[PDB]
Design an enzyme around this catalytic site. Structure first.
Site, PDB file in Angstrom:
ATOM      1  CD  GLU A  77      40.332 131.473 105.956  1.00 25.18           C
ATOM      2  OE1 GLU A  77      39.754 132.641 105.438  1.00 25.18           O
ATOM      3  OE2 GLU A  77      41.231 131.022 105.205  1.00 25.18           O
ATOM      4  CG  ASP A 117      47.399 149.031 111.840  1.00 25.73           C
ATOM      5  OD1 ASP A 117      48.667 149.231 111.593  1.00 25.73           O
ATOM      6  OD2 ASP A 117      46.851 148.171 112.829  1.00 25.73           O
TER       7      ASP A 117
HETATM    8  N1  LIG Z   1      47.529 131.668 113.103  1.00 22.36           N
HETATM    9  C1  LIG Z   1      46.559 132.733 113.263  1.00 22.36           C
HETATM   10  N2  LIG Z   1      45.302 132.507 112.649  1.00 22.36           N
HETATM   11  C2  LIG Z   1      44.470 133.509 112.819  1.00 22.36           C
HETATM   12  N3  LIG Z   1      44.311 134.800 113.372  1.00 22.36           N
HETATM   13  C3  LIG Z   1      45.715 135.038 113.851  1.00 22.36           C
HETATM   14  C4  LIG Z   1      45.640 136.431 114.649  1.00 22.36           C
HETATM   15  C5  LIG Z   1      44.558 137.303 114.587  1.00 22.36           C
HETATM   16  O1  LIG Z   1      44.616 138.496 114.790  1.00 22.36           O
HETATM   17  N4  LIG Z   1      43.324 136.828 114.356  1.00 22.36           N
HETATM   18  C6  LIG Z   1      42.210 137.417 114.615  1.00 22.36           C
HETATM   19  C7  LIG Z   1      41.113 136.942 115.208  1.00 22.36           C
HETATM   20 CL1  LIG Z   1      41.352 135.220 115.771  1.00 22.36          CL
HETATM   21  C8  LIG Z   1      39.886 137.429 115.130  1.00 22.36           C
HETATM   22  C9  LIG Z   1      39.624 138.845 114.812  1.00 22.36           C
HETATM   23  C10 LIG Z   1      40.841 139.319 114.284  1.00 22.36           C
HETATM   24  N5  LIG Z   1      40.442 140.728 113.819  1.00 22.36           N
HETATM   25  S1  LIG Z   1      40.064 141.025 112.262  1.00 22.36           S
HETATM   26  O2  LIG Z   1      40.032 142.309 112.273  1.00 22.36           O
HETATM   27  O3  LIG Z   1      40.372 139.885 111.276  1.00 22.36           O
HETATM   28  N6  LIG Z   1      38.261 140.828 112.319  1.00 22.36           N
HETATM   29  C11 LIG Z   1      37.421 141.318 113.419  1.00 22.36           C
HETATM   30  C12 LIG Z   1      36.040 141.444 112.336  1.00 22.36           C
HETATM   31  C13 LIG Z   1      35.802 140.053 112.012  1.00 22.36           C
HETATM   32  C14 LIG Z   1      37.452 139.853 111.450  1.00 22.36           C
HETATM   33  C15 LIG Z   1      41.920 138.818 113.932  1.00 22.36           C
HETATM   34  F1  LIG Z   1      43.048 139.175 113.274  1.00 22.36           F
HETATM   35  C16 LIG Z   1      46.936 136.534 114.956  1.00 22.36           C
HETATM   36  C17 LIG Z   1      48.075 135.882 114.893  1.00 22.36           C
HETATM   37  C18 LIG Z   1      47.967 134.720 114.325  1.00 22.36           C
HETATM   38  C19 LIG Z   1      46.745 134.001 113.810  1.00 22.36           C
HETATM   39 NA    NA Z   2      37.598 134.838 102.310  1.00 22.62          NA
END
Ligand SMILES: Nc1ncnc2c(C(=O)Nc3c(Cl)ccc(NS(=O)(=O)N4CCCC4)c3F)cccc12
Ligand code: NA
Ligand code: NA
Lengths: 402, 400
Positions: free
Chosen positions: A83, A124
């Site tokens: 997202e 975290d």
């Molecule tokens: N404006 C922003 N919109 C979206 N993201 C952002 C981020 C970010 O870090 N995004 C991000 C992404 Cl692109 C991909 C994986 C994870 N890791 S997760 O743990 O969620 N994950 C891995 C298993 C599936 C889900 C993640 F956190 C940081 C800063 C701003 C934004």
């Molecule tokens: Na959701």
């Protein structure tokens, strides 16, 4: 045109950088004609990435946990698509940039409650890891838990885990039991509650931390040296929030409320629900003995809540209107509540000038009294734990399921 | 064997169902178990529609989740969430594993999905038991209802309420105004309400359809010949459901309630909330004059609701405990309600056998009165529409 990278269904412009996520850059991109954020992962983290992903998949969707779309592998890299979000909670708060602080914390907490119920501890939780959505078709924004890099699914039958099973967390947000010299008890789900507690204050205080400036944060956490002085001591909303946050950041993990317990706290009550609590309480104590345990407990410390004589702390029209039964003792918590109930019930029958001061039922009416008596709800919520087991009061208090 | 396209994969033996003359395979996407919908070149325009509209509206818990589309040389493929069964199986399959999903909640979830679609200016046009899906169980063994099959959907532009009747799909569940050119009004969102209304009756009658058996259904819908005879007219729960369903299947589309309005109907109220409605009503009217329009409306046709004298239709212990209040009129709806309000409030103080006859608050208490006076709620609801605008009555009525 500027550069574009295409790896199957995932595509992004490397110029459109959104930030980072622990360590790996994050770019704005596209997937299946959905707008998405795209994280590029090096070979050395492939194993970790897949374990985060599987945990995200094999764990029920929830609106306040981040939606995972797809991963595409590549000869050099791996690509995780999720997202697209407007910002981190950190950016929201730091930059002061429609969305209610309380509703944000509520949504974060529900996301946490959802994880805990799947036996997942996050480890975290901090402002950088809570994302704030893009507005949907109706303008509505919500908070969402992200970054499952330090997650742990605890096996069935286990309720705790080892301190030393990985990285302890992010310095400044780490529960004391992760880092203290003595490991009296193994960490459990309540590590996230401590973090959450710090996040709450951060949001409510508009950037402060209970354990101080960054340089000494973690050391103060180990000492138990917190200060919640951004919260006004004689302000209803701050009194209530102090009561909750104090418990959430307690040094003894066993004294911290569960995520579901936190969601039941008055902090999250609508104004209507607050008023209804005051009504139920009043009704419940209407024919209670003045020397019995309930009223003794409700009047213990009551003079300070009432401010000695509550009839001196209300507007003049109400003072005038309350000259009908002189049985309302001005130094009684019971009678103050009793008077609130009376003027809520008989509201339609009251003089036009009296209805003008109080304001409309329910919102302005309850605020009239909470604004003037900032400890009334916090005091009454505590004292009436005596009746928490009763059917009527089950919506206001939290009980472990049968 | 096993077919692979892009990210989509499935074994062609595992057939879950068929469609537009389209096949649905059990399969795989991005290491998830999913349903895989395979579509022919003829139906690509409607594959693009489903996909686009699911991308807009699948965030809702009661709308089916959409995962990915893969185009092919011969075919096209849509991967959606895998589900356990259809509503049709839930209702008609003998001793079905309800798994905690009660009929009323199923319909509330279905309607909540529909209200979500409508708020996005999306009209389904083909709601029926076959495409209301029952989920796989989640980690806590909970199941839910979900809307699906968005091929025949329609997105209306902003400030378009109406759409042209196009030549649909299969007969049985289609509103009259969508088939007969005889109708003056072009169809709107209320086509789905009509369908929903038939679905409601189907679920709570446990297989029956208001307009009859399959053969005569669509002809009866054009004629306006319905029958709600599985709803008994002197049982509270059936009187409430009949009031709602009659409005939902109305021949005049404008008379049908919107989805948000449906969700506000007593049909969906808990026992607690029904009781709270009785309390609020009684409190509202306590110091109203007996000749005023509210009490006049409340007492209009009241003798039938009260069964001539409500004192003669309550248990003996309650009769005795109410003799105390000389002023209560046996022929009055108002005083019945004031009696209920009084004994709720003073419940803990009441004598042991009076508490024992009424039952515990709130559930047994409210059922005591609704069981003995099955038109009381439906009547009071209709009457107190006069105060629907007021704040106190916000939880009970809907305001546009
Ligand atoms: N404006 C922003 N919109 C979206 N993201 C952002 C981020 C970010 O870090 N995004 C991000 C992404 Cl692109 C991909 C994986 C994870 N890791 S997760 O743990 O969620 N994950 C891995 C298993 C599936 C889900 C993640 F956190 C940081 C800063 C701003 C934004
Ligand atoms: Na959701
Ligand atoms: Na969904």
């Amino acid at each position: 045109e500027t550069s574009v990278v295409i790896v199957g269904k995932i595509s992004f412009c490397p110029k459109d950088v959104l930030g980072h996520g622990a360590e790996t850059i994050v770019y704005r991109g596209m997937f299946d004609n959905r707008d998405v954020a795209v994280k590029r992962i090096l070979p050395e983290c492939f194993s970790f990435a897949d374990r985060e992903v599987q945990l995200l998949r094999e764990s029920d969707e929830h609106p306040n946990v981040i939606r995972y779309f797809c991963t595409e592998k590549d000869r050099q890299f791996q690509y995780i698509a999720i997202e697209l979000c407007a910002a981190t909670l950190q950016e929201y708060v730091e930059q002061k940039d429609g969305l209610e602080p309380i509703t944000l914390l509520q949504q974060t907490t529900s996301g946490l409650a959802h994880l805990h119920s799947l036996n997942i501890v996050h480890r975290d939780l901090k402002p950088h890891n809570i994302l704030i959505s893009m507005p949907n078709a109706h303008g509505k924004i919500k908070a969402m838990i992200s970054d499952f890099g330090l997650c742990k699914k605890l096996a069935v039958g286990r309720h705790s885990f080892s301190r030393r099973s990985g990285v302890p967390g992010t310095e400044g947000w780490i529960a004391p039991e992760m880092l203290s010299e003595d490991c009296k008890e193994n960490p459990t789900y309540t590590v996230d509650i401590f973090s959450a507690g710090c996040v709450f204050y951060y949001v409510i205080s508009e950037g402060s931390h209970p354990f101080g400036k960054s340089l000494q944060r973690q050391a103060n956490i180990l000492l138990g040296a917190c200060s919640l002085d951004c919260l006004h001591p004689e302000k209803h909303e701050d009194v209530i929030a102090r009561e909750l946050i104090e418990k959430m950041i307690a040094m003894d993990p066993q004294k911290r409320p569960s995520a579901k317990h936190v969601l039941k706290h008055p902090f999250f009550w609508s104004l209507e629900k607050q008023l209804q609590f005051f009504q139920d309480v009043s009704d419940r104590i209407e024919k209670e003995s003045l020397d019995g345990p309930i009223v003794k407990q409700l009047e213990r410390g009551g003079r300070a809540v009432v401010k000695m004589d509550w009839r001196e702390n209300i507007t003049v029209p109400l003072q005038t209107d309350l000259r009908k039964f002189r049985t309302y003792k001005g130094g009684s918590v019971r009678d103050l509540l009793r008077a609130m109930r009376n003027k809520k019930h008989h509201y339609r029958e009251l003089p036009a000038e009296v209805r003008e001061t109080l304001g409309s039922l329910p919102d302005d009416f309850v605020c009239y009294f909470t604004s003037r008596f900032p400890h009334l709800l916090a005091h009454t919520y505590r004292a009436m734990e005596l009746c928490s087991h009763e059917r009527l009061f089950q919506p206001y208090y939290f009980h472990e399921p049968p």
